[PDB]
Design a protein around this nucleic acid. Structure first.
Length: 112
RNA sequence: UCUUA
């Protein structure tokens, strides 16, 4: 274990291909939550990229494997979720809303 | 593609 990067005591999962003006916290996490509980997330509207932190490394690999064959489409752009090669941990420099509520958002689908 | 324009 811990051979393929130190994604255990600290995980960085990077999501990309998010359009500026369309990089919402809810949707990025909407991808995260159904495969695993989202503990942290970071949206970088500037680089059209984002970070998604998950409860277990198993979730990170699962999402990557899924979106490799079935990508997430935002504004007609396929999102690419991958494990970051440069960073081991995500620290929230910017605060966010309750992520559990985002689970309710996912279940609501289109504001049920 | 890699800390929030």
């Amino acid at each position: 274990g811990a051979m393929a990067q130190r994604k255990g005591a600290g995980r960085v999962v990077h999501i990309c291909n998010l359009p500026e003006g369309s990089c919402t916290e809810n949707d990025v996490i909407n991808l995260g939550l159904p495969f695993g509980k989202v503990t942290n997330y970071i949206l970088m509207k500037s680089t059209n990229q984002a970070f998604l932190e998950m409860a277990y490394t198993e979730a990170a690999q699962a999402m990557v494997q899924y979106y490799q064959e079935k990508p997430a489409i935002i504004n007609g752009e396929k999102l690419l979720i991958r494990m970051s090669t440069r960073y081991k941990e995500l620290q929230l420099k910017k605060p966010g809303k309750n992520v559990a509520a985002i689970i309710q958002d996912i279940h609501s689908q289109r504001e049920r």
